[PDB]
């Protein structure tokens, strides 16, 4: 439960991906199978980079769950 009490209606797995957390704290909202859920990673963990052209492509599984591992390694300094 990432949205908490103010999450909305219903509350079940079914064929839809729901709020999922991450090591760095990346809260992934509701979704579904075969859905490319992309988002710019929080590289600004101090104050580095002044462009930021990388992304985090975390697609959901086809059965109805999140993928094994997300490609967050694409994040790098401003060089």
């Amino acid at each position: 439960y990432c949205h908490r009490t103010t999450i909305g209606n219903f509350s079940g797995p079914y064929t839809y991906c729901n709020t999922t957390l991450d090591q760095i704290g990346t809260c992934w909202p509701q979704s579904a199978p075969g859905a490319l859920v992309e988002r710019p990673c929080p590289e600004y963990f101090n104050g580095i980079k002044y462009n930021t052209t990388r992304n985090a492509y975390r697609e959901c599984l086809e059965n109805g769950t999140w993928a094994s591992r997300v490609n967050y390694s694409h994040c790098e300094p401003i060089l």
Binding site: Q23, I24, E43, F45, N46, G47, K49, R69, Y72
Partner: peptide, 15 residues
């Protein structure tokens, strides 16, 4: 920055 971005991203591979 020079030595932070690394640890920052180093924590990204864990994701």
């Amino acid at each position: 920055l020079a030595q932070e971005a690394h640890k920052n991203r180093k924590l990204l591979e864990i994701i």
